[PDB]
Design an enzyme around this catalytic site. Structure first.
Site, short mmCIF file in Angstrom:
data_model
loop_
_atom_site.label_atom_id
_atom_site.label_comp_id
_atom_site.label_asym_id
_atom_site.label_seq_id
_atom_site.Cartn_x
_atom_site.Cartn_y
_atom_site.Cartn_z
N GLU A 136 0.63 -1.39 0.06
CA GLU A 136 0.00 0.08 0.05
C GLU A 136 0.89 1.18 0.11
O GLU A 136 2.07 1.21 0.69
CB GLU A 136 -0.96 -0.01 1.05
CG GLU A 136 -1.96 1.21 0.99
CD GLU A 136 -3.03 1.26 2.28
OE1 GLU A 136 -3.75 1.81 2.11
OE2 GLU A 136 -2.66 0.75 3.28
N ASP A 154 9.24 7.30 0.58
CA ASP A 154 8.38 7.86 -0.28
C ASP A 154 8.35 7.01 -1.67
O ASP A 154 9.11 6.30 -1.43
CB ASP A 154 8.97 9.39 -0.90
CG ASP A 154 9.86 9.55 -1.83
OD1 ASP A 154 10.60 8.53 -2.13
OD2 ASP A 154 10.07 10.35 -2.51
N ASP A 170 -4.29 11.75 -2.53
CA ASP A 170 -4.28 13.08 -2.99
C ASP A 170 -4.64 13.38 -4.22
O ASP A 170 -3.88 12.77 -5.10
CB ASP A 170 -3.20 14.02 -2.28
CG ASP A 170 -2.97 13.87 -0.76
OD1 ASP A 170 -3.88 13.67 0.05
OD2 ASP A 170 -1.71 13.54 -0.22
N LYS A 194 -4.69 20.66 -9.37
CA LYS A 194 -4.06 21.86 -10.22
C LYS A 194 -3.32 21.03 -11.07
O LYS A 194 -2.48 20.06 -10.84
CB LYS A 194 -3.26 22.59 -9.31
CG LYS A 194 -4.10 23.60 -8.09
CD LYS A 194 -5.09 24.80 -8.81
CE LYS A 194 -5.50 25.48 -7.88
NZ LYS A 194 -6.32 26.49 -8.17
N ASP A 253 -13.04 8.55 -3.45
CA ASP A 253 -14.49 9.02 -3.30
C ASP A 253 -14.21 10.36 -4.13
O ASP A 253 -15.24 10.97 -4.61
CB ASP A 253 -14.82 9.52 -1.98
CG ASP A 253 -13.72 10.52 -1.48
OD1 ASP A 253 -14.39 11.52 -0.80
OD2 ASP A 253 -12.55 10.65 -1.49
N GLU A 312 -10.01 4.09 7.49
CA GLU A 312 -10.85 5.08 8.30
C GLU A 312 -11.50 6.16 7.75
O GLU A 312 -12.90 5.88 7.75
CB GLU A 312 -9.60 5.78 9.10
CG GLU A 312 -8.63 4.76 9.73
CD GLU A 312 -7.46 4.45 9.10
OE1 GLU A 312 -7.23 4.76 8.09
OE2 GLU A 312 -6.39 3.87 9.79
#
Ligand code: NA
Lengths: 206, 203
Positions: free
Chosen positions: B34, B86, B108, B112, B144, B182
């Site tokens: 993940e 990362d 995220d 932009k 979502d 969560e």
């Protein structure tokens, strides 16, 4: 009767479309791109697209004779000279057009045929993707709109399995500001409903 | 330091195990990762569900990964490691083919255009996933965010991946073993659609 109406307006509702295979430019009287809609229904979409885009030639395909009579009347009321209507099915497209004669296929609210054993009757199934290829050749795109979530999910996977490139996707078209969006009769009655309209543009890789 | 005392779960030197993560787990179970594990509910729940799969979670923020460590400890699952690295470091940690799947959960969106290069479904990152999976793996992606999901379907397609699963309303699509994050659990009471894709490499 409906059959007399179509026989009287045979300049719009072309009865002998196979006679123009490879010569559709001579039918429109110009070399502009031909876009087709498979499943014209009552014809608001193709009439609206003909008036919006007079430098595009439009050919609506509609098997259901009862509804195509309405499409002929809306094409007539539009006064658009860049739209013909054919009373044929998607399988007959290859009798009517040579490869590359069509530049784009519109599919709007196609029958979802949700049952597993009816997959082959969906207009996004591989067999119809091949028919669309045989009339569009190297380039060519499909512009697809549906409210049916099951059909749109199926279609994205079918498009992907066939190897098409997804260049546009909206999962809520009416909140996505697609400028110049022409609604079908069915689509018009959705903004009040609030259920998302799904949209894809997919192209052949070149 | 909390991590130093739980250094058998949080691995501080993951680059040393490149090509030998089977010696860390002690078996040849497929390795699933993940990218962006957050506080760790998902990777904990997946580890408990699939004891025959080795899970490696990556989280950039130490302040968040300590919560993931605790949730892995509380699950008592022995098939989960957590790396504070990362996504660009993945190729220093894994040999091509050592990873079998990439999980991306509520990444995220970076709407932009100058920050398209930061989205984890951007071609740069699909290439990093290819460099640790070779051609035998998949990406399982939930969000979502409609904009990011639309971008991601297009990015997958331009990269040439095969879309084998897509849900435009996951919580009405009956995915049998769905483990929620969560964020997924709390904020899906709204009835906001959850989007999900499974994409794989074409052989
Ligand atoms: Na003419």
């Amino acid at each position: 009767w409906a059959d007399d109406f179509l026989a009287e307006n045979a300049d719009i509702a072309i009865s002998n479309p196979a006679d123009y295979k490879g010569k559709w430019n001579t039918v429109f009287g110009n070399d502009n791109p031909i876009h087709i809609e498979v499943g014209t229904g009552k014809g608001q979409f193709i009439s609206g697209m003909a008036k919006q885009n007079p430098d595009i030639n439009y050919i609506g395909i509609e098997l259901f004779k009862s509804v195509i009579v309405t499409a002929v009347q809306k094409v007539k009321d539009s006064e658009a000279q860049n739209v013909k209507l054919l009373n044929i099915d998607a399988d007959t497209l290859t009798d009517v057009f040579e490869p590359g004669e069509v530049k784009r296929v519109y599919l709007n609210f196609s029958d979802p045929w949700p049952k597993k054993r009816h997959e082959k009757r969906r207009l996004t199934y591989s067999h119809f993707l091949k028919k669309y290829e045989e009339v569009m050749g190297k380039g060519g795109s499909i512009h697809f709109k549906t409210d049916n979530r099951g059909l749109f999910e199926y279609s994205l996977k079918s498009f992907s399995e066939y190897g098409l490139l997804l260049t546009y996707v909206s999962l809520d078209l009416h909140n996505s500001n697609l400028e110049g969006n022409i609604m079908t009769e069915y689509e018009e009655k959705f903004s009040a409903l609030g259920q998302p309209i799904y949209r894809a543009e997919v192209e052949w890789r070149t």
